[PDB]
Design a protein around this ligand. Structure first.
Ligand SMILES: O=c1ccn([C@@H]2O[C@H](COP(=O)(O)OP(=O)(O)O)[C@@H](O)[C@H]2O)c(=O)[nH]1
Ligand SMILES: O=c1ccn([C@@H]2O[C@H](COP(=O)(O)OP(=O)(O)O)[C@@H](O)[C@H]2O)c(=O)[nH]1
Lengths: 287, 290
């Protein structure tokens, strides 16, 4: 028979998941009600794709989208200049948050982007996407603009998740936070959140950032605050060593949130969380 | 940190085991060896695996058993024709109702065998080699202090569950054990002393549970590994691998005291070990304490 996890999943899908997120750009603009929207593309040596991603979002600039920023992580290729020519604002880690020395990894970039943006809603889109669709941003912000109580929207793709998602993230969530197994692509890089939420949570480093944000949001607000939207079809993207490193950090970040100690020992082959940005810039009682 | 891993690889890992069958037979020193093949609906491959081991029966190997887990194909008759004794779960341990999964089968075989050394070999192997059992027992017979030998396969120039799930989780929770190349492998040998005294995890958790319990109780130097030869990674459906991963997680969490919800994947998940076989077969166990 059904479990409590099953029952919650079914109703969460009914209320908080959209297979056909067909809101129009015009209706979303009309719903902003004074809120502004920032779009952030984290980038490190993505010269072949960053411009193409920017180009798909640029038509929204000045209407639905208020700012379009490429947060560069120290690229040595032509990422920055291609993002400039394509119509984005390029901001380095150092300019985004001058008072803190950078550390490596994606989570650092997304955290710093909170200091460099002003939008009430922040949308993250990976800069390595080959086939970005222009409706990604509208779909991601729909539930934030139209659905009471939602603070985090995860974009998922139908396929014509991957290995880390299905072997590592979802099974560990089943063990530790089973309600969150309803989220189809918990590691996805296309997602949006409110400034209120994102400024208030720590940011995990590196490959842990997505899972960390998902679990921190759940632990504070539960499923009601999390939604997901189908962004369309896309094929699964990596070398096993990259995936194993990803997994190891997903494990470390989940463990840090779920009361499991971690040796700190990285993968044998043959760094810390950043505090909430509201400690530097700018309820759901259990009683 | 890698100092410990380096010394263990130098002393407890063999990429090219030299041992001959005759040398191993001469080292038995009165110990006996049982070989157990768990099998559920493996009619296509079980006979071929048995045939590679049968020439050792009466010499290096004292018992050769297929522990059938409820097959409805021709697994049993084909294993018998190849020279194995076929034992059902019920015959192995008649007064205890069977539960599903591989760990149950390996645990029950302890009550149906007499060896001082028990060797487990999967019955679904497509390309078995007759030197598997010799290589697995070498460190038990010729080294001192080894109680568990893990057979690994060199890969042409482990799988996704091994590299994305088992090894990273061991790095987090039992960091020395990342030195074991293929912790989830189904070809391994253990002493009766060890195997009779530890709980057995259910289903797909049995291998990692035995590895972790051996490590904790007897130490790193009680574990060895041997290269069984080059074997290509087996391609399994992602849903099967995900179910395996979920049970590996459950078993490791049990061994660490992490609350696991028991919730499976939208898949079977048990958190309940079988107790040490010496609790149910105390007189058998005492007879084999030697
Ligand atoms: O330190 C990093 C790593 C990645 N990325 C970006 O984050 C996205 C995801 O990259 P990936 O997960 O492949 O990171 P990597 O595998 O290169 O560490 C892409 O848009 C990268 O350019 C980034 O800005 N900084
Ligand atoms: O409940 C079970 C599950 C598996 N096995 C055996 O254990 C090995 C690994 O099991 P798996 O299910 O991965 O192999 P498959 O059944 O897919 O061939 C094989 O020799 C199986 O026949 C068994 O005896 N009982």
């Amino acid at each position: 028979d059904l479990t409590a996890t099953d029952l919650a999943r079914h109703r969460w899908l009914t209320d908080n998941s959209w297979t056909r997120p067909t809101w129009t750009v015009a209706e979303l603009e009309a719903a902003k009600a004074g809120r502004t929207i920032s779009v952030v593309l984290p980038a490190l040596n993505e010269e072949e794709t960053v411009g193409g991603v920017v180009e798909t979002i640029r038509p929204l600039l000045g209407g639905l989208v208020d700012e379009l920023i490429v947060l560069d992580s120290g690229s040595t290729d032509d990422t920055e200049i291609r993002a400039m020519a394509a119509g984005a604002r390029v901001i380095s880690r150092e300019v985004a948050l001058p008072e803190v020395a950078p550390q490596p990894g994606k989570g650092e970039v997304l955290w710093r982007s909170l200091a460099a943006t002003t939008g009430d809603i922040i949308v993250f889109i990976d800069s390595d996407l080959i086939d970005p669709d222009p409706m990604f941003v509208p779909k991601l912000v729909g539930p934030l603009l139209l659905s009471e109580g939602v603070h985090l929207v995860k974009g998922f793709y139908r396929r014509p998740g991957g290995r880390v998602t299905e072997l590592v993230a979802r099974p560990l969530l089943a063990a530790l936070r089973p309600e969150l197994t309803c989220v189809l692509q918990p590691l996805g890089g296309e997602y949006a959140g409110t400034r209120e939420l994102l400024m208030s949570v720590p940011f995990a480093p590196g490959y842990g950032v997505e899972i960390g944000l998902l679990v921190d949001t759940y632990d504070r607000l539960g499923l009601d605050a999390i939604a997901q939207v189908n962004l369309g079809v896309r094929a699964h993207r990596r070398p096993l060593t990259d995936l194993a490193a990803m997994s190891r950090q997903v494990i470390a970040t989940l463990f840090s949130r779920c009361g499991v100690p971690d040796s700190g020992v990285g993968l044998t082959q043959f760094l810390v969380d950043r505090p909430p940005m509201n400690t530097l810039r700018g309820h759901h009682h259990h009683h």
